[PDB]
Amino acid sequence: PPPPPPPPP
Amino acid sequence: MLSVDDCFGMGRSAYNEGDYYHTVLWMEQVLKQLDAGEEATTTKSQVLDYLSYAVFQLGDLHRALELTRRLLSLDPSHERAGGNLRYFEQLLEEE
């Protein structure tokens, strides 16, 4: 799997 | 005279501009005040989420790892902690 998305705004 | 939650808002604002250097400074201050026991709606978990990511963007894999492990310990079902831990452990093997 790829890393999760970055923290949201 | 900036509250804990004010400092977190400052760090989030800096993060959203891609200023990870100042994200780290703001989030370290927030975390210091939370760990001292001050009240706030911001949680330790929220702080460690932004802090670990900004530290990583600055290139410090070992500290991002340590912060991510702390985040996971406090928030096992966190959206990102577990996946980031896996990825960071992978990058550790390239050493």
Side-chain angles (χ1 to χ4, degrees), chain B residues 1 4 12-13 15 21 23 25 28 34 37 43 56-57 60 74 81 87 89 93:
Chain B
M1 298 282 184
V4 171
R12 197 170 185 141
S13 184
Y15 163 89
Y21 171 74
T23 302
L25 294 181
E28 283 170 332
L34 288 177
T43 62
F56 181 64
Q57 297 304 312
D60 189 346
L74 299 182
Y87 176 64
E89 299 261 26
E93 267 195 337

Side-chain angles (χ1 to χ4, degrees), chain B:
Chain B
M1 298 282 184
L2 285 175
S3 69
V4 171
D5 290 322
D6 291 339
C7 293
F8 180 73
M10 295 277 171
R12 197 170 185 141
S13 184
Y15 163 89
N16 287 328
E17 307 210 21
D19 184 344
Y20 304 116
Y21 171 74
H22 288 117
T23 302
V24 169
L25 294 181
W26 283 112
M27 294 306 175
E28 283 170 332
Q29 174 70 31
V30 176
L31 191 63
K32 169 180 75 162
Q33 288 177 241
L34 288 177
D35 283 341
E38 272 149 80
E39 320 271 355
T41 88
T42 307
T43 62
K44 286 150 155 40
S45 163
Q46 280 177 286
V47 183
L48 292 162
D49 187 23
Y50 289 92
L51 181 52
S52 59
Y53 186 92
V55 165
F56 181 64
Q57 297 304 312
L58 298 182
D60 189 346
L61 164 67
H62 297 171
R63 189 186 181 198
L65 263 168
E66 185 174 64
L67 294 156
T68 298
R69 282 170 183 146
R70 187 183 173 195
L71 169 49
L72 193 64
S73 81
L74 299 182
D75 204 337
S77 296
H78 187 270
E79 211 84 345
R80 297 167 277 286
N84 288 341
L85 180 51
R86 277 193 243 112
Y87 176 64
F88 292 157
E89 299 261 26
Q90 293 173 210
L91 291 177
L92 200 61
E93 267 195 337
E94 297 173 16
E95 293 183 347

